[PDB]
Design a protein around this ligand. Structure first.
Ligand SMILES: [Zn+2]
Ligand SMILES: [Zn+2]
Ligand SMILES: [Zn+2]
Lengths: 173, 173, 173
């Protein structure tokens, strides 16, 4: 949990979603069904809206924010890796945001995309569907393989099940 | 909030500052007027002092620490981007520390400087005023433009207003 | 603290260890004597076990997780730097994981190793003993010097003392 409203705007969280009590969700944030927000993950909807599509996960120590005129939209089946940071960007469906990677303002990530760990997607950068992105500044290095494409969805499914495990079996001690 | 003292040393926080209750401020830490510390941001003043100049922001999931003999001094109008990490360094005025970047021990960042997202400033590295720094190890790639210089201050001003919004309108639900 | 069990599995924490109340320890996690987990550090043992050897520290805003079939084992005298991320990897003794670095699944870090800040150790990557690793993807650039080797242990010792300071002198205010 650790949900807050700011100036009237309240987060809209679907009942099936899992928001760790150590995560922080503030203001204009929408979490669709079967989404999950993990420990120390922060979704600060105090400027533009932060929309998180169904079956998507926002892992441990992630930050999601926006800039004026630059809302953040996360698609379906999106995996936002541990310690990653998404800032005022649009992310398509079946996208794996690598651990500790960074997606900046105005960027547009296509569907079925994998952003490598530690990669930095520059402002306004557009990433085509089925791409593997690496480096700083991140560049499309090649297209995803059949295996990787399957994974762009399975990674998210694994988290949907994991989220449910926590909702039913977590206990503070 | 989530403020703690350690062995007698208590943080000195100006009344106008905003410290998110999910942030963690420990020991020898000084926060001047109109400063702001956001969710999961950690300022651990358990070794050397951590000084944060007025109008500066320490964003979500940032860590600020020190090494023996290496205190951390943040200037005025400094923006420490989401998930960044400052360790025993001296940062001048009107500096934007990029998202997920790293500033190491002994480094000295001049005034009106922009450190790119994911950049790593090596130990004892000195950055001249009006510089744009990119890479790992971070290097001065060019001087800031008129627009960027204006931004080195406006970024901080935006946060001063944002901080006030939170102080007056945040509500746990 | 902020310790939780999940589906029966409870963390096993030695009495001498220090777990900041703002850190998050979940499930199958073992913390040996004189270990320390700092603010916003997250050890999610909800898949494979996370084992932390004695005298090791998991610094501020770190995340430690695993993948199915890929448990995370941290050796003795290991320093996991601020904002770093270890995912389903095996780390030897006297290893310094650089600030904001990333160690991926299947990797095996030898003993007396230093991973540079912001470095990314690729999946299944094996790092020889006494190595300095830099870059993305991280590569062994040279062997450690006498000074650095001494440091691979002293860094951890400093934290053992620091941990004790917190256990005895921390006070919420
Ligand atoms: Zn932001
Ligand atoms: Zn430190
Ligand atoms: Zn994971």
């Amino acid at each position: 949990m650790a949900i807050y409203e700011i100036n009237g705007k309240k987060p809209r969280i679907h009942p099936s979603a899992f928001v760790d009590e150590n995560a922080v969700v503030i203001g204009d944030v929408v979490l669709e069904e079967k989404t999950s927000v993990w420990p120390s993950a922060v979704l600060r909807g105090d400027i533009e809206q932060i929309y998180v599509g169904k079956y998507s996960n926002v892992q441990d120590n992630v930050s999601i924010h926006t800039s004026h005129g630059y809302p953040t939209e996360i698609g379906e089946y999106v995996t936002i890796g541990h310690n990653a940071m998404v800032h005022g960007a649009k992310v398509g469906n079946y996208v794996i945001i690598g651990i500790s990677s960074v997606i900046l303002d105005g960027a547009k990530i296509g569907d079925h995309v994998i952003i490598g760990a530690g990669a930095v997607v520059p402002p306004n950068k557009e990433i085509p569907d089925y791409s593997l992105v690496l480096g700083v500044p991140g560049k499309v290095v090649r297209q995803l393989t059949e295996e990787e494409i399957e994974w762009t969805k399975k990674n998210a499914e694994i988290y949907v099940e994991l989220a449910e495990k926590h909702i039913k079996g977590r206990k503070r001690i």
